[PDB]
């Protein structure tokens, strides 16, 4: 059919200086630089095409932009008429070539204006075959799976091996994980083995808490050591295409990533709540001076249900991501805001709850130990001053000893153990002070013999009321055994590592914002530095502003695996040597 008067524009034709347009030979011989606003010359138009050929990277955009660019920069001109590109040719780029409007914006002549791009025009570029599909620039890899595509750059996905770190750093972090993972694995297994060998004696609170603590660090170690199996790391971290496993469970991928995630994360969070059960056990152990065997229902409910709820909540929002350096799948690697709510929030909480029971625990210990020490001090002041009154050859010696006794009795009256028991204790000293005041009156009158005799009566007021409560105060504090204080030592030892773990995830969370910015800028640099560069000069490589600290990661792994080793030393006693020697004697 004859061409529409509107699907063309009046422009003087000039012969084509280039027989080829972006790698494809042209079916016509004349062109016009009227459609390209940025160009006035054919040489200028060609140079702009070299700038636009920088979109070779991001194939989904390159596939549709190629016919549009030839239709604008090198269009067909015949008998003082240039053929305009159709609207459908222009509109087809808007979607995949979203990278253009995000960075430099679409030029005025390349915006789909009803005038600049009329509807249903015979494009002519439809007859030209653009064989070039496109390739992905480092650190992106070519993929046709849409679930793996990196933001606006369609057709490209981030490579499986962490681009922010070298192979030297990869092997170094793997050797670090191999060393800490295996020793924790052997330490926890040995500890679990002693517990099951003497199961009926071992299965008793609070000793049984550390078994379940070691159980968590053992299961967790299995997940961390999984990657060291022949080609397992790539089965857990890499996608089918060759990209990083991000946004899992997804659909068409293997469960190998989510399986390792559940193994690591569930065991991690179960280990932190079992630590809180330990801090609570040590808190309530001083309140026995209420058995823990009854509260087993509350412990096993919270320690196994709460990590399950969090594991399920992550798999629902699908935030399971894989990392090649760590060699495991975890929550919030890509979306760090999810790592704050599922890693920093529960670790922040266990520090508050666990910390409270550890602080209130020593507060109960040091308060009860001081109250006894102060009572013993006042009790000894009374006994020492009684001897002074017995030996006193004058009333000034009797008066001075009694005033010191009055101050000691009133001070010891204020003392409270950690009420009808308090009523008789306070009244016991009320009688004594009242008797001291009567003895002081005799000393003030000068009656030494009468004040000395009145002082002998204080001895029985002390034995009848005071002595009965002093023996009780001593017995309650004697009830504090070594296993009780050892539990607290382990509690603070575990608290330390949890405080370090928190600080590491807090550092990663605080600086991820810039690490992602430094990455996007690095990726965009790889496509910018390739364009607008002299033909003779080799392409200079781009750099990353900032990346995660491998030292902070190593400190986090030391804190995580450190707890697993430190909690395994609960069975490094005399009694556990007996269990292995008696089983060895049974075998041979
Ligand atoms: C991740 C990668 C693929 C995205 C980066 C694509 C780069 C190469 C794109 C994005 C915006 C583009 C520019 C948008 C506008 C113009 C104006 C025109 O007069 C000459 C070309 C030029 C300057 C384009 C050249 C290529 C460009 C810089
Ligand atoms: C390269 O050019 C684009 C133009 O849109 C710009 O947005 C981008 O930031 C540039 N890259 C660098 C690293 O400056
Ligand atoms: C390039 O074109 C030829 C035909 O000219 C075709 O056989 C080949 O497959 C094309 N290349 C690609 C990668 O499509
Ligand atoms: Na022009
Ligand atoms: Na899956």
Swiss-Prot record:
Could you list which ranges are Extracellular topological domains? 1-176, 227-257, 319-341, 508-559
Give the glycosylated residues.
131, 252
GO molecular function, a single term = protein sequestering activity
State the covered range within the intact protein: 58 to 553 of 787
Domain FZ intervals? 8-124
Q: Which organism is it from?
A: Homo sapiens (Human)
Residues annotated to bind cholesterol:
38, 333
The domain-related comment in the record is: The N-terminal extracellular domain mediates sterol-binding which is required for maximal activation of signaling. Contains a second sterol-binding site within the seven-transmembrane pocket which is also required for activation. The activating sterol is likely to be cholesterol. The extracellular site is required for SHH-induced activity while the site within the transmembrane pocket regulates basal signaling in the absence of SHH.
Q: What is this protein called?
A: Protein smoothened
- Keywords linked to the UniProt accession: Cell membrane, Cell projection, Developmental protein, Disease variant, Disulfide bond, G-protein coupled receptor, Glycoprotein, Membrane, Phosphoprotein, Receptor, Signal, Transducer, Transmembrane, Transmembrane helix
Membrane spanning residue stretches: 177-197, 206-226, 258-278, 298-318, 342-362, 487-507, 560-580
| PTM | Phosphorylation by GRK kinases is required for interaction with protein kinase A catalytic subunit PRKACA.
Give the UniProt subcellular location, in the record's own words: Cell membrane; Cell projection, Cilium
